[PDB]
């Protein structure tokens, strides 16, 4: 997966999306839909779907929602206040946590100002807490801005890594785009019928 402070961003495009294989997979620990309840996804069409991916702690999945606060939603990944998509999350302790501590999953814990929604910040400047110029060196009130989850397999739930995917359906002003599949039927040759082609 991708870090939490530099999430990924895949722009799903024109295709045939089947959110039912997602919705009923029962492997997801969290499947919340906000703009639109889940069962009506396979019956609507938008312009673009974006999918963002990252990895967080177990008990920070409640900050991936419109209108929250905390070190994740403040400055790592902010969701607008009229979100439309759905948020999916599942535990991944066996893949991402390794004995001795997996120190490759970082997050940002200091920033000047909270993020704008869907804004991204991969800089690595020394956070200047004190008026004293940091000059680019560490010290009191001059802190490196990135910390690392040290994940370990013997962690209580709520400290084990969860993988998160945020689908965001957007509708600019194009002519059309991706929509859900559509079943059909057979042919009843010789039988006054009510049809839709």
């Amino acid at each position: 997966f991708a870090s939490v402070y530099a999430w990924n961003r895949k722009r799903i495009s024109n295709c045939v999306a089947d959110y039912s294989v997602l919705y009923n997979s029962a492997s997801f620990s969290t499947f919340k839909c906000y703009g639109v309840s889940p069962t009506k996804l396979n019956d609507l069409c938008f312009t673009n779907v974006y999918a963002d991916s990252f990895v967080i702690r177990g008990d920070e999945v409640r900050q991936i929602a419109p209108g929250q606060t905390g070190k994740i939603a403040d400055y790592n990944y902010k969701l607008p206040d009229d979100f439309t998509g759905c948020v999916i999350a599942w535990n991944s302790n066996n893949l991402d946590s390794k004995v001795g501590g997996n120190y490759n999953y970082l997050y940002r814990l200091f920033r000047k100002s909270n993020l704008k929604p869907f804004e991204r910040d991969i800089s690595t400047e020394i956070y200047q807490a004190g008026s004293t110029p940091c000059n680019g060196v560490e010290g009191f009130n001059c802190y490196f801005p990135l910390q690392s989850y040290g994940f370990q397999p013997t962690n209580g739930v709520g400290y084990q890594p969860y993988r998160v995917v945020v689908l965001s359906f957007e509708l600019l002003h194009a002519p059309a785009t991706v929509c859900g599949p559509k079943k059909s039927t057979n042919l009843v040759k010789n039988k006054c019928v009510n049809f839709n082609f």
Partner: antibody
Amino acid sequence: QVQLVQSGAEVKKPGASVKVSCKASGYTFTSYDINWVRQATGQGLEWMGWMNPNSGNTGYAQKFQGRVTMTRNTSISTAYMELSSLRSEDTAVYYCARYIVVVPAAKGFDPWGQGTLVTVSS
Amino acid sequence: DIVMTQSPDSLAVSLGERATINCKSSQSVLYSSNNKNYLAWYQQKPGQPPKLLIYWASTRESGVPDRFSGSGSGTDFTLTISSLQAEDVAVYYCQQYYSTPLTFGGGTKVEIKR
């Protein structure tokens, strides 16, 4: 949880050396600077902050220099302190604290060690 | 350099009173628009490690009831606990921040009536 565990309430003879430990828990460890203070019998405190999560250059209080050495281990996040050439008036109690920070500027020390005892005298 | 001289000492006054502990040296307003302050208040029970009280000088008490209440300015300030009650008998130090070391000294006891 947010804790600090010290150990080593002990007695030394003058002209010797001592190592003191502070065990941490409930945090990422390498993310908040450890700061130790002295405290005599019914007096004030001192010892400026120093040391950092990663590597950390470490500082000092400029009247304690040379005798002071700060060593830690990334095996569990346990900061220590090595004092040397004791002069039988440095007998005091010694503390630990996490010095927590928050967006703007850190606000005082997060936790507070349980303290320890060093008694120097022949 | 910056000496935190605290004037009052042993304010052994009847509970509920309103102590006023002053100290100052060599301002630490700290630029960067963060015009707040730079020094916490502390409480150390006798035979105990210290604890944390008002910080930023900005009343910012944490798990701490309202009677303990700070104030602040550029150089001078005060803790000013209100409606003091039994078990607030401690020693109350100050801070310095970007400075280097610390400095402070204060406490109370009782007074009685007879």
